[PDB]
């Protein structure tokens, strides 16, 4: 469906700019991507398409049972013709009766832990790389949907949760029935591209960014002064929020009860 | 504009979809492709009788001086519903 309106320029329903540096890009259409994948059965990848409003690539799959087509985030290496299946709505009969037992942790992983297959995080063995990690038992995928991102399974519990390490390095507690696609998000070379010119940024709906030092004392805490002057003022946003030093913008009353090992803060040190 | 802009806008001043009728009446309905089908149940006709042999003219000779009707003792002289009913009995009783 088309992506049009004043929201493309960074305006909310009031009409004022709530997101700076937006507007004027190319005309786009939104692609309805499936992040739940409840319908079971084999799905044939028809083609790997390019999504403008996404970092990774989307694959147009086709349900061989009904013929319905849908979009899904393509995995690193997934090509046309590959067969994917979602075991989120339970295991099929043919696969369940083969082993005969109630559950065979060995053979199930050998036949279902394939690239592009969506399974509950519990059915995936430890050490597997996934890129559509869910949060709730019946919620869509929310983590590692960007290009080149993935997550590993640290440990499993009898328990209702499983631990996974996200792209940021945060080991957090995830539900047991949370969905997860095996593999890595395609387009792993996205963070290496270079636009080359200012005009290419204007096509992507990015408008110029004016620095606080370039403004007057009336519209920024950094404005004012003769010549180039920071003003002995600690870096802040136009509204007084510290822009450096480690000030966390997460609400204190909203404690993350799913965090096992928090991220490793760099603390302003240089990486390279 | 300075002053003509302050007059009442008419159909002879603008063309960008500005329509304004002259209260001529609705004679049909518009179609979905821009036509008009006339509903003759709304069209009006003029019932003009046969004037052949009619002797009355719109003027009366001034020799016949004007004289108003008199209704002594009756406040609603000409509009009296009783003198109309009583007069009806003698003149025309059937209808």
């Amino acid at each position: 469906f088309p992506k049009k309106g004043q929201s493309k320029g960074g305006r909310n329903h009031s009409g004022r700019v709530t997101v700076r540096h937006r507007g004027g890009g190319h005309k786009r259409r939104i692609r309805m991507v499936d992040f739940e994948r409840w319908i079971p059965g084999p799905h044939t990848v028809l083609r790997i398409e390019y999504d403008p409003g996404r970092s990774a690539h989307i694959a147009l799959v086709k349900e061989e049972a009904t013929g319905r087509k849908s979009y899904i985030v393509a995995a690193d290496g997934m090509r046309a013709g590959d067969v994917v299946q979602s075991y989120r709505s339970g295991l099929p009969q043919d696969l369940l009766d083969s082993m005969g037992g109630v559950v065979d942790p060995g053979i199930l992983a050998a036949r279902t832990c394939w690239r592009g297959n969506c399974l509950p995080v519990s059915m995936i063995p430890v050490g597997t790389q996934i890129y559509c990690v869910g949060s709730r038992p019946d919620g869509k995928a929310v983590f590692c949907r960007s290009a080149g991102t993935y997550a590993t399974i640290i440990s499993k519990e009898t328990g209702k949760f499983v631990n996974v390490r996200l792209q940021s390095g945060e080991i957090r507690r995830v539900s047991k029935d949370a969905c997860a696609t095996v593999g890595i998000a395609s387009n792993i070379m996205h963070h290496y591209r270079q636009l080359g010119k200012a005009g290419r940024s204007r096509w992507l709906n990015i408008r110029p960014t004016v620095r606080g030092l370039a403004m007057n004392a009336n519209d920024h805490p950094h404005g004012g002064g003769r010549g180039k002057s920071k003003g002995n003022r600690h870096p802040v946003s136009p509204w007084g929020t510290p822009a450096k030093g480690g000030y966390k913008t997460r609400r204190k009353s909203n404690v993350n009860k799913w965090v096992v090992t928090p991220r490793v803060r760099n603390m302003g040190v240089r990486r390279n | 504009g300075l002053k003509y802009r302050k007059l009442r806008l008419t159909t002879k001043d603008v063309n960008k979809g500005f329509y304004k009728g002259n209260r001529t009446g609705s004679m049909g309905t518009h179609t979905s492709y821009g036509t008009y089908k006339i509903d003759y149940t709304k069209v009006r006709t003029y019932v003009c009788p046969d004037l052949t042999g009619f002797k009355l003219t719109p003027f009366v000779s001034k020799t016949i001086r004007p004289v108003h009707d008199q209704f002594p003792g009756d406040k609603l002289g000409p509009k009296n519903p009783a003198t109309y009913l009583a007069r009806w009995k003698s003149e025309n009783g059937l209808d």
Partner: protein, 76 residues
């Protein structure tokens, strides 16, 4: 429809308004019809064309004298 010139209520005083428009209709007759020709100027005596012509010229000149004054001039 024929429009009318906007005018002031009292000629040269009052608010600016516009009279009601005029509507003319042209019927395509099935039988032809021809109008008579106007009488010659020397045959309009039944309408007092002689006196009416003098009064018209008198009013005709009065409107020309006012037009010269409206331009900021005077007849030498």
């Amino acid at each position: 429809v024929n429009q009318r010139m906007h005018e002031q209520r009292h000629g040269d005083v009052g608010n600016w308004r516009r009279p009601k428009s005029q509507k003319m209709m042209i019927a395509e007759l099935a039988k032809p019809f021809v109008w008579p020709k106007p009488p010659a100027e020397d045959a309009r005596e039944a309408f007092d064309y002689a006196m009416w012509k003098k009064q018209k010229t008198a009013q005709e000149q009065d409107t020309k004298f006012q037009g010269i004054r409206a331009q900021g001039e005077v007849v030498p």
